[PDB]
Amino acid sequence: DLLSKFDGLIAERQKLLDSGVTDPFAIVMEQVKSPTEAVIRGKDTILLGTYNYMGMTFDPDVIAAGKEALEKFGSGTYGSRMLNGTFHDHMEVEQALRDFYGTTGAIVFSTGYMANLGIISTLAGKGEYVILDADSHASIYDGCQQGNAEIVRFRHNSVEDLDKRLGRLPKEPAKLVVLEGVYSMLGDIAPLKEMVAVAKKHGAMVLVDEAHSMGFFGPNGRGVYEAQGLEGQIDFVVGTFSKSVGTVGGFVVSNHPKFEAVRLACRPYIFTASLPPSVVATATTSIRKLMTAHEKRERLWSNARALHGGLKAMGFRLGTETCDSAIVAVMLEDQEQAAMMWQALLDGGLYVNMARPPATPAGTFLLRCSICAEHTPAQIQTVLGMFQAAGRAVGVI
Amino acid sequence: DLLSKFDGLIAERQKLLDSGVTDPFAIVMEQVKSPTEAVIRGKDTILLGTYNYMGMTFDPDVIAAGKEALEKFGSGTYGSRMLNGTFHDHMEVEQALRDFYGTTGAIVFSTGYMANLGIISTLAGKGEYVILDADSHASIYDGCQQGNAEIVRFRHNSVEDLDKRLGRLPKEPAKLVVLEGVYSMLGDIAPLKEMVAVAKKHGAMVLVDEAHSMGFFGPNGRGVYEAQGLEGQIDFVVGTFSKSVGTVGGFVVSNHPKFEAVRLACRPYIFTASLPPSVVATATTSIRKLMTAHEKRERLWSNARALHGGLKAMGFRLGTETCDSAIVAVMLEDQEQAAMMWQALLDGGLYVNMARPPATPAGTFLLRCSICAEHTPAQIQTVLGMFQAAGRAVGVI
Numbered sequence: 001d002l003l004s005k006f007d008g009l010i011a012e013r014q015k016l017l018d019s020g021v022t023d024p025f026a027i028v029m030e031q032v033k034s035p036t037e038a039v040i041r042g043k044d045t046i047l048l049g050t051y052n053y054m055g056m057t058f059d060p061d062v063i064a065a066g067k068e069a070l071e072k073f074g075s076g077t078y079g080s081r082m083l084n085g086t087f088h089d090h091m092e093v094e095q096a097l098r099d100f101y102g103t104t105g106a107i108v109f110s111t112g113y114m115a116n117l118g119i120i121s122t123l124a125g126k127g128e129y130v131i132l133d134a135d136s137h138a139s140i141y142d143g144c145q146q147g148n149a150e151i152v153r154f155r156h157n158s159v160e161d162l163d164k165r166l167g168r169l170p171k172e173p174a175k176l177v178v179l180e181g182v183y184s185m186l187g188d189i190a191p192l193k194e195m196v197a198v199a200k201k202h203g204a205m206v207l208v209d210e211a212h213s214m215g216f217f218g219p220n221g222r223g224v225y226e227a228q229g230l231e232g233q234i235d236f237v238v239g240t241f242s243k244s245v246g247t248v249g250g251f252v253v254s255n256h257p258k259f260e261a262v263r264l265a266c267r268p269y270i271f272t273a274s275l276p277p278s279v280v281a282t283a284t285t286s287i288r289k290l291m292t293a294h295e296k297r298e299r300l301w302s303n304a305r306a307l308h309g310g311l312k313a314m315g316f317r318l319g320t321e322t323c324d325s326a327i328v329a330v331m332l333e334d335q336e337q338a339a340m341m342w343q344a345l346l347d348g349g350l351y352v353n354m355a356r357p358p359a360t361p362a363g364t365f366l367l368r369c370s371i372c373a374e375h376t377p378a379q380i381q382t383v384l385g386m387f388q389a390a391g392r393a394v395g396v397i
Numbered sequence: 398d399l400l401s402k403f404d405g406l407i408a409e410r411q412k413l414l415d416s417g418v419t420d421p422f423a424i425v426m427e428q429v430k431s432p433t434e435a436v437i438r439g440k441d442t443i444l445l446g447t448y449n450y451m452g453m454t455f456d457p458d459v460i461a462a463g464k465e466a467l468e469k470f471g472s473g474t475y476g477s478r479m480l481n482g483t484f485h486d487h488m489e490v491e492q493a494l495r496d497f498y499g500t501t502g503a504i505v506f507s508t509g510y511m512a513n514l515g516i517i518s519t520l521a522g523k524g525e526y527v528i529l530d531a532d533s534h535a536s537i538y539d540g541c542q543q544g545n546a547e548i549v550r551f552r553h554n555s556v557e558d559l560d561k562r563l564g565r566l567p568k569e570p571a572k573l574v575v576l577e578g579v580y581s582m583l584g585d586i587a588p589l590k591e592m593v594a595v596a597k598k599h600g601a602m603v604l605v606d607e608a609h610s611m612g613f614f615g616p617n618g619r620g621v622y623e624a625q626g627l628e629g630q631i632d633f634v635v636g637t638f639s640k641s642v643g644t645v646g647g648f649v650v651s652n653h654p655k656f657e658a659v660r661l662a663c664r665p666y667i668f669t670a671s672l673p674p675s676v677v678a679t680a681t682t683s684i685r686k687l688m689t690a691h692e693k694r695e696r697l698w699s700n701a702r703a704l705h706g707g708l709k710a711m712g713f714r715l716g717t718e719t720c721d722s723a724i725v726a727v728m729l730e731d732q733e734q735a736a737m738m739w740q741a742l743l744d745g746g747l748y749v750n751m752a753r754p755p756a757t758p759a760g761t762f763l764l765r766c767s768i769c770a771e772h773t774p775a776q777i778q779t780v781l782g783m784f785q786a787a788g789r790a791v792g793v794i
């Protein structure tokens with residue numbers, strides 16, 4: 001029947017479960033103390049495998065705004081904004097995004113995934129081109145699949161191949177180059193300055209996903225593009241509320257004068273219910289605080305550099321030579337070593353992300369650490385000690 | 398550039414704005430009293446254009462659970478359930494859905510739109526068939542577009558054409574018939590009993606969307622399929638939290654023994670952040686209450702029948718001969734009459750949905766009333782009086 005196609009996935013998964021102890025795909029946090037600590041399998045555990053970059057999820061203003069919105073506006077919404085009306089909160093979160101990014105346009109979506117799906121599939125039509133890195137996020141590929149444009153992959157992280165591939169396309173049709181500021185697998189950064197120069201040379205529009213940079217790259221925290229001096233050169237910036245902001249949602253911002261027309265045409269925007277009052281309230285409050293969260297940003301980067309430098313010094317192989325983002329990736333030799341290391345860390349009171357094939361390329365086995373602004377220096381030292389102990393015990397270092 | 402393709406939509410929209418007064422695509426509820434009343438354009442307004450069927454959005458247990466979840470678990474989540482872990486609330490809402498539908502399987506998604514997008518595109522692969530009503534919801538069509546299956550439209554509401562179209566397909570490949578219980582445009586009901594018999598005759602699996610029926614069709618409130626005696630014959634049921642439950646989210650339930658494999662393959666499930674604690678808490682609490690919300694169900698249907706019967710008696714042309722759902726559709730003669738009627742109602746203190754081409758078929762111009770369990774009999778009488786007054790003033794009756 002229709003599920004026979006999954007027999008292979010089912011068998012593969014079971015083999016993988018049988019070879020390990022804890023199922024990394026079924027981690028549950030049973031109680032929570034903070035953005036950095038929860039109980040997992042009955043043990044107080046430092047959280048280092050989650051995307052709460054700015055530790056906004058327990059911010060007292062964020063929480064208060066969510067509670068108040070529940071009280072005053074209820075648990076849900078009337079339906080589609082366009083068809084059934086909305087609370088004023090939606091206009092307010094879009095204004096907050098305009099203010100955050102310094103743009104004339106902002107459109108909020110129910111998720112970051114849907115923001116990418118919708119914007120890519122709506123902007124590029126039949127006969128047009130979407131040009132993207134070979135290792136682009138799934139949501140970006142899914143937007144290409146949802147649309148009717150031509151797809152043009154370029155070799156991962158290659159300015160030269162972007163240039164060559166773009167230059168070989170027909171000149172007249174409109175083109176969307178889609179880039180990510182941070183490559184999330186290893187935590188390295190895209191050469192956006194150089195790539196955007198290439199895109200503009202070929203007359204393409206540029207969309208940059210800044211999901212992994214919000215509040216901590218660039219003078220205003222707008223992202224890698226801002227840090228690299230590209231203010232005013234990026235046609236569209238897509239992001240999410242689910243990493244730095246601290247709730248669900250997606251958005252696209254732009255200065256394009258016709259940007260509002262996207263609401264008229266974008267099916268994933270039109271055909272879904274608007275976000276609940278509590279969600280919009282937490283997002284708006286968080287976004288406004290992120291504009292000036294200098295202390296959080298400071299701690300986030302200090303913590304990231306401490307962890308990166310500390311692990312490097314211990315002899316771990318990292319995904320990056322320098323600490324370039326809030327993701328620190330430890331590279332292991334094989335599937336078993338990665339699982340044993342991950343398990344040792346978990347058993348000792350540390351949760352990190354494990355990434356293995358086919359989620360990563362064959363031959364790449366990672367422990368990915370995502371730093372939080374609310375990690376303390378002591379916690380980062382504890383983490384380093386836990387890595388040292390597990391790494392020695394397993395034989396990684 | 399990439400937005401030149403919207404020049405037509407932009408011009409059309411502006412012409413439509415110029416011909417009316419209030420923009421029906423930018424309705425804002427500035428303050429809220431209840432599920433049935435808000436301030437719109439400074440006026441106390443009865444809400445009859447929203448999808449809050451069971452009035453759960455201000456239920457005191459629902460609100461309390463949302464507030465408590467914010468306090469205890471914060472505003473957001475760790476990321477993807479599969480990759481970054483989750484709170485136990487996600488397993489709990491899936492259990493609530495298993496209990497609600499009496500199924501062995503339940504998978505929650507970030508939206509109903511994504512549940513349809515994901516399940517359709519994941520279940521039916523290359524060489525397989527998705528068979529759907531010509532007037533299917535956009536999310537169902539978008540799932541077809543996201544997937545690589547063959548698409549097979551059948552004539553709207555035609556058991557005979559479903560049968561004929563199915564019978565003419567190659568026999569061996571697996572097939573998904575996708576049906577909606579309630580046709581939301583006019584508020585009529587699908588002949589699911591007859592259509593499911595046809596699907597099974599041809600060996601197809603059946604997916605039914607029960608977004609417009611949850612808590613008020615069938616002995617257990619499971620949907621039109623339950624009401625029509627199809628318990629145990631439906632392979633998959635898809636729904637949303639955004640109508641009856643009172644928050645955002647989608648789900649699919651099933652008794653298929655391999656249903657869990659969908660998590661391994663379904664990209665819109667994998668590549669998005671899990672729903673926030675407050676959202677999951679409000680959903681779980683609401684779903685559990687909906688299992689036994691007999692009083693709400695009673696009022697909802699009483700209100701629907703009162704409105705339908707009352708409008709019919711006044712001489713309005715309705716989309717249905719009998720009151721078959723909680724959507725009552727008033728059919729108007731032309732674009733202008735619909736707008737004038739809608740505007741008169743709004744100005745007088747009643748908000749209903751207006752649906753016109755190209756959202757409806759050319760020649761169909763609707764005012765759609767969506768009833769709430771928390772409407773009072775007095776409010777429904779007030780609504781009838783408002784329709785009578787506006788209809789006379791505009792010339793509809």
Ligand SMILES: *Cc1c(COP(=O)(O)O)cnc(C)c1O
Nearest residue numbers: 111112113137139211240669670
């Ligand atoms: C996180 C992320 C997403 C998904 O955002 P959600 O809000 O979790 O749906 C999509 N694309 C990119 C590049 C991301 O980083």
Ligand SMILES: *Cc1c(COP(=O)(O)O)cnc(C)c1O
Nearest residue numbers: 272273508509510534536608637
């Ligand atoms: C309401 C509805 C949807 C959308 O659900 P959201 O949760 O608002 O995304 C999708 N399909 C059908 C048939 C619906 O009725």
